[PDB]
């Protein structure tokens, strides 16, 4: 293998003929005003300690990101990566002081970056001689920080000899299709002291990868299918680095509006005159019961457990999600009641056996899934790393109720219940 930088003579030709979908802008193309405004936003966020490293699950394993990070952007939005749903600390489209001003700042930056992106995608679709407008509609930014020479060893980038790296080779998952990504970098063989972003064609380690030096304020853009045709990575220097990576996320199953409406659909099968521990289900068509138990699972695990695993990231940063998340927890325990209601009806004296088997076969996949996933989550909350962390770094394991708590109709452990119903059906 090998790699190239603006030193090498064939760099510019390799870029033109094998990486053309990538664009650079030196800090020189950006306002003075904007430059120091964003840097001051960045810094006041570091002093207040909002940048958290997240505790992730990847291929069965519980790991700790060396970069610290935070997710800002559209209110009600979420962005899922490495099995972690980051929730928006919001910026002001139509909470705590001194932080509002940085979110405002990064939104101004988002508008600027939008502008430049659309110009570039114009020129590109011009070389080709609502996709454009929406592939620039950045809805969130993932900010991230790393102080090198605090890591105890950094992985040597292994296919091209690019030296130590702070982010392995990857694509930016879960973005809308052919959407660009706009980065703002902030620094302080190839040169090891200076920060670089490195690039390579996927599956490929013959074609020499590029490694672009990024000085303070340098910006770049991954356009069209670039983010899919190539993977990238971030090579470290010696000074701490910031970067703000602005993206258009697939938030079609990941907004507070969406999960709420899902809840209303589940609850439509429920007699809603009053609200008490007294759930009487409106229908028993198997399909409806199944859709209910699925929405049960979706709000429990994609929304509750996720929110509370990033234990106190949130009520430290903003309060925005509090009333929302409280509301989601309420709807979830009413769904617990719905489930207990079905569990009652299925064993009732004088229910025809064929209906019993139909209703079982409708719900059992969702019950089994709820069981397996509560197992994973209590495991992850009592992880190697988790159960021995800073006392605030610990994730919370919510919802979790004990046996004696009668406020909850059904147990937290359902293995015997799934065993029971499966032992009915296979007879
Ligand atoms: O520099 C980067 O920061 C983000 C981070 O989220 C890594 O997972 C990303 O995707 C990069 O390439
Ligand atoms: Ga990336």
UniProtKB/Swiss-Prot annotation:
Binding residues annotated for substrate, in chain numbering:
69, 81, 170-173
Q: Which GO terms describe its cellular component?
A: cytoplasm; cytosol; intracellular membrane-bounded organelle; nuclear speck; nucleoplasm; nucleus
Q: Where on the chain is N6-acetyllysine found, per UniProt?
A: 155
Question: Which positions in this protein are listed as binding Fe cation?
Answer: 170, 172, 232
Where, in this chain's numbering, is 2-oxoglutarate bound? 144, 220, 241-243, 245, 247
Required cofactors, per record?
Fe(2+)
> EC annotation?
1.14.11.-, 1.14.11.53
| Sequence segments annotated as region (Fe2OG dioxygenase domain) | 5-252
The UniProt family comment states: Belongs to the fto family.
Please give the subunit comment from the record.
Answer: Monomer. May also exist as homodimer.
What name goes with this protein?
Alpha-ketoglutarate-dependent dioxygenase FTO
Record lineage: Eukaryota, Metazoa, Chordata, Craniata, Vertebrata
The gene behind this protein is FTO
